[PDB]
Amino acid sequence: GVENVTELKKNFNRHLHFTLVKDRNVATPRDYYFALAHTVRDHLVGRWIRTQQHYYEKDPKRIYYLSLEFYMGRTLQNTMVNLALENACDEATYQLGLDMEELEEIEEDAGLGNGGLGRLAACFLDSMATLGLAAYGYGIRYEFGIFNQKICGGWQMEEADDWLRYGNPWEKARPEFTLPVHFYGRVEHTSQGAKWVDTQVVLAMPYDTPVPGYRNNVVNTMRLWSAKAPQAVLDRNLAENISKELRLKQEYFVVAATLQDIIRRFKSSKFGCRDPVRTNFDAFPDKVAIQLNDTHPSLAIPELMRVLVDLERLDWDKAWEVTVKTCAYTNHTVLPEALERWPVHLLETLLPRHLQIIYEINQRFLNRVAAAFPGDVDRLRRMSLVEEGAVKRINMAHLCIAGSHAVNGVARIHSEILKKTIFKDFYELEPHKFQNKTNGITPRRWLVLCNPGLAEIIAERIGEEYISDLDQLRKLLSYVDDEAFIRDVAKVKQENKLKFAAYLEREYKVHINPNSLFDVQVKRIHEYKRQLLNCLHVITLYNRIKKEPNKFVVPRTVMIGGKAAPGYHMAKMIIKLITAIGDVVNHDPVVGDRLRVIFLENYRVSLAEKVIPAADLSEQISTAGTEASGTGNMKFMLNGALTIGTMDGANVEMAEEAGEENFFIFGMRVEDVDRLDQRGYNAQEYYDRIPELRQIIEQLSSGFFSPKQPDLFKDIVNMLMHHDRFKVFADYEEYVKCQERVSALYKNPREWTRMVIRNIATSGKFSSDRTIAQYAREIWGVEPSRQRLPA
Amino acid sequence: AGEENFFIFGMRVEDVDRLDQRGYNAQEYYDRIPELRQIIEQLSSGFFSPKQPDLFKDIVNMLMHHDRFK
Ligand SMILES: Nc1ncnc2c1ncn2[C@@H]1O[C@H](COP(=O)(O)O)[C@@H](O)[C@H]1O
Ligand SMILES: *Cc1c(COP(=O)(O)OP(=O)(O)O)cnc(C)c1O
C-alpha cells in the first residue's frame, strides 16, 4: 500500500464502504475518522508483521514492561508522525473534501491511564520502539478511564468515560489466544510437589495494539488483557469486573496472563515453527527481561517462581536464580507512606499458593541478612517482608527488592534517598542493586507532533537527526545571539499562542488576550502541589491592579488545570476557588484583559498537547521535599516555556542543565522545610508580618469572592491559617518576588527568547530515548539500535 | 462545691481562643520543658515498645505537630 495521496484516498474509500459498511449518504464525521484511522492502520500493520518476524529470526532478549496503566492519548496523529504520513493524509483527505484536524478531534484518548506513571510507560513504549528494542508493554484493557471531569458551576462533575463505545480502530481482539487466570482454591501438597486445586477461573482475552518507532520501521506490541467470566450471575459480575480485593485481583490478572505469554514465546523460539525446543530454562534470563513499573505487577515474582517450581519442576534455588536475574523494579514514590502492603488474610483466600511462596522467599531472604549481619535481630524485623502489628501485611516493595536484580528511582536525589533512608538496610545488604534512571519524555509526541513549528525551525538549522538524538539540540547554543533564530523562536510561540486562544474561545466563551504571557500550571489538584500558592499570587496581581488601576502590568492569562480525586474534599474546593476567582477577576471592568484566570477542564494527553506548546511559564511550585520526578516539567522546557519553581524533583536536574541563571527557582529548599518542621511552622507569623497576605485571607473569609455564600471558603482559610502541611504562606513572599522578576524579564522580548533558546538547547538530557538506552545497557543487558528496517 | 474543694487546672475557654489567635505552636512548650523532652524521646525510641520501635510515632507526630486539643 503506498504513501502516495492516490492510494491513500483509494484506501480511505475502500475502508469507509467495505470495512465500515457506510456510505457518503449516512456517514458522519466519526465514520470518516474510522476510515482514516483504518487507512493509516494498514501501514502500521505492514511494519508490525515484518518487525515481529524479525524478532523471531534474531531471537533477541525481549523486554516486558508490565504496568497497571499506560496513558496512551490518541493514536492517529502519533502514528502519522512516526510513519511520515501526516501530509499525504492531509492532501488525500482535503482532496476528498475532508479536513483532517476536524477528524483527528473525534478520537478518544485511550482510557488506560490516570497520570504520570501511565504517561511514563506510554513514553517508554515510544522510545523502546524508536531504539529498535524487542519490547512489549503488557496491561489490563480498561473499558472506562478514570472519569471525565465536567465543571458545572465551579463544581466538578465526574462524567463517565466509555472511550470504547464505538469500537477502537487501532486494536485487534485475539479470541484464539485467551488464557486462564485462577483465583481462590486450596493448596494440596502432593508427593511430587504442591498443587493449587479448587480454583475459580477467569479468562483473560488478548487485545493487540501496535506501537510505531519514529521512522525506523520498527513497530512493537502493546498487549492488554480483558477479563471474561467463562450463584453464577454474581460469580460472573465480579469476574467480568476486573475490566480493596478487586485491586489485588486486577494486579494478579495482568501478572498471570502475561507470564503465560512470556514462557510460551520463550519456548516457541524457532522462526516458522510453532512448537517448543527451549526447554532448558538456563537461558531464560538471557532471553527475558521483566520490568516491574512500581509495585503493582509485583506478584510477577512469586508467580514466575510458582510456574518454574510447581509446573516446570525446576528446583527452588535454580528457579530463584532465574527469577532475580529476570526481574527489575522501578520505584516512583518518596513517601514510605504510599507503599503497597497487602494483608496476608486477603492473600491466603485469594492466592494461598503465592503466600506460601512469599513466606518461603522471606524465610530464605531473612536467613541471608542473618549471616550478613549476625546478632542484629531488629535489622531482621526491619527487613522482613511480612510486617506484624495490628494487621499483618506483606510489604510488596521488600518483595520486589528481594526478588529483583536492580531497583531504581526516577531522579538522582530520589534514588539517593532510596539508598540513604527508605531502603537503607537493603542498600547495606546488596548495594549493587540500587541504580538511578532519571525520567524522560519522548521528543515525538512531546515536540515534533504537538509542536511542528518549533521542530521546523530547529530542523532548518540542524536537520532532523535530533528527534532521536535530542542531545544534538546543544548545537543551538551557537544561535543564542543569532537575530534570525531569536526572531523565529519568538514567532513560533506567537503562532502557537494564537492557535490556543481561538480554541479557548470556541471552547470556553471568554476572550483571552493572545499577548498576555500565558502562565500555565497543569498538575493533579492536590495540596502538596500548591495550586493555592498560585491563587494567592493571582489574587495579589488582582488587588495590586485594583489599588493602582493605571500602573503598567505585564498582561497575563493564568491557566490552571488538573483532576481532583473524587472524595477529596479540599481538592474539589480548590477547583471551586480557582473558577470563583475567575468570575470576580475576569469580569471586573478596571482589569480588562490585564489579568484573566482560567480553569482548564478535563486535562489529559490531547489537552496537554494543545496547551504546553503555547505556554510561556511553567508553574513547578510543589513544597520542596514532596516531589520525585516531574515529566511535565520537561515537556514545558522542550517547548519554549520558562519554569518558575522550587528546587525539587525534575526542577533540580533541569536548573543544572540549563544553568540556574536561566531558571526562576525560589523559596525553601529541603533544608529549610526541615528546619521549619524542627522549629514549628506557624502561619500566623506570616499572616501578621505581611499586609498584602492579610488582605487575601480577609477577602476569602468575608465572602468577596463568593458573595452569595459568604463562608464557602472557610475550609481553605482555616486549613491555611491553622493546619497547612505544605507551608504555602512560608513561600508566598519569595514566590511573588520571583514572579516580579519573571514579568520584568518578559518585558524584554529578545532577552526572554534568548533564555528560552538556552533552555531548549540544554533540554536533551530529558528525552526518554536517553532513559531507555540507560535501562537497556545498565539493567536489561541489551543494546539500543537506530538500525532502520526495510518497508 | 466551691472551687476550693475542686482541682481545676489549665486553660479556660478564653485562654485557648487567645492561644489560637497567636497560633498554637506545640514546639515552644517542648523546647522549654525538659521532662516533656525526655518523654517524647522515650516514645520515639521504642522505649515503651521495644520489639516495634516506631509503633507510637504516629501519635508522637500528632502531639508534636498537629495537636488540635493542646
Ligand atoms: N515462530 C515464528 N516465526 C515467525 N514469525 C512468528 C513466529 N511466531 C510469531 N510470529 C510473528 O509474530 C507475530 C506475533 O506473534 P506472537 O509473538 O506469537 O504473539 C505474528 O503475527 C507473526 O507475525
Ligand atoms: C506530562 C503528563 C503527566 C506527568 O506530569 P506531572 O509532572 O504533572 O506528574 P508527575 O510527573 O507525576 O509529577 C501527567 N498527565 C499528563 C496529561 C501529562 O501530559
**Domain span holding position A721:** 441-767
Task: Clarify whether residues A776 and A734 are in a common domain.
Answer: no
Nearest to A684 among B22, B53, B65 (CB): B22
Number of domains in chain A: 2
Approach to solving = X-ray
Q: Is B22 in CB contact (< 8 Å) with chain A? A: yes
Say if CB A50 and CB A212 are below 8 A apart: no
CA dist A788 and A274 (Å) reads 27
Task: Clarify whether residues A420 and A479 are in a common domain.
Answer: no
Q: Residues of A forming the annotated binding site for AMP?
A: 23, 56, 264-273
**Cα(A117) to centroid(ligand 2), Å:** 8
CA dist A314 and A310 (Å) reads 8
Cα angle A480, A485, A487 (rounded to 5 degrees) comes to 110
Q: Closest Cα partner for A543 from A689, A698, A735? A: A698
Q: Is A723 in CB contact (< 8 Å) with chain B? A: yes
Say if CB A600 and CB A578 are below 8 A apart: no
Alpha helices, H only, A214-312: 232-240, 245-267, 284-287, 300-306
Amino acid at B38: Q
Task: Clarify whether residues A774 and A741 are in a common domain.
Answer: no
Task: Clarify whether residues A784 and A745 are in a common domain.
Answer: no
Residues in chain A closer than 8 A to B17 (CB atoms): none
Residue located via cell numbers 473524587: A566
Name which residue sits closest to atom 18 of ligand 1, judged by CA: A265
Helices A29-58 and A75-82, axial angle in degrees (round to 10): 50
- The experimental resolution of this structure, in angstroms, equals 2.9
Atom of ligand 1 nearest to the CA of A270: 1
CA dist B7 and B4 (Å) reads 8
Residues in chain B closer than 8 A to A722 (CB atoms): 20, 23
SS3 at position A789: coil
Task: Clarify whether residues A379 and A480 are in a common domain.
Answer: no
A137 lines ligand 2 (CB under 6 A): no
State how far Cα A264 lies from the chain centre: 30
Q: Is B51 in CB contact (< 8 Å) with chain A? A: yes
State how far Cα A603 lies from the chain centre: 13
Say if CB A22 and CB A16 are below 8 A apart: yes
Task: Clarify whether residues A561 and A457 are in a common domain.
Answer: yes
- In sequence order, the 6+-apart residues with CB closer than 8 A to the CB of A145 are A109, A110, A111, A112, A113, A114, A161, A163
Q: How many residues appear in chain A?
A: 791
CA dist A621 and A633 (Å) reads 11
CA dist A512 and A596 (Å) reads 7
Task: Clarify whether residues A592 and A663 are in a common domain.
Answer: yes
Alpha-carbon torsion A265, A271, A276, A281, what sign? negative
Atom of ligand 2 nearest to the CA of A604: 17
CA distances from A208 to A136, A183, A694, A791 (A): 10, 25, 58, 21
Atom of ligand 1 nearest to the CA of A269: 1
Task: Clarify whether residues A7 and A145 are in a common domain.
Answer: yes
**Cα(A132) to centroid(ligand 2), Å:** 26
The CATH number given to whatever domain includes residue A608 is 3.40.50.2000
Task: Clarify whether residues A209 and A244 are in a common domain.
Answer: yes
Task: Clarify whether residues A601 and A670 are in a common domain.
Answer: yes
Task: Clarify whether residues A720 and A777 are in a common domain.
Answer: no
CA dist A98 and A702 (Å) reads 54
CA dist A602 and A68 (Å) reads 22
Best residue for ligand 1 mutational test, from A50, A51, A52, A218 (most atoms within 8 Å of Cβ): A52
End-to-end CA distance of chain B: 27
| Buried-state track A533-551, b at ≥16 Cβ within 10 A, e below 16 | bbbbbbbbbbeebeeeeee
CA dist A127 and A468 (Å) reads 8
SS3 at position A423: coil
Beta pairing partners, A148: A159
SS3 at position A151: strand
Please give the DSSP secondary-structure letter assigned to residue A169.
T
- In sequence order, the 6+-apart residues with CB closer than 8 A to the CB of A626 are A334, A528, A648, A726
| Buried-state track A311-333, b at ≥16 Cβ within 10 A, e below 16 | eeebeeeebbbbbbbbbbbbbbb
CA dist A547 and A691 (Å) reads 14
Task: Clarify whether residues A780 and A685 are in a common domain.
Answer: no
- Listed in order, strand segments (DSSP E) in A294-347 are 327-330, 341-343
Q: Closest Cα partner for A90 from A98, A732, A257? A: A98
Please give the DSSP secondary-structure letter assigned to residue A47.
H
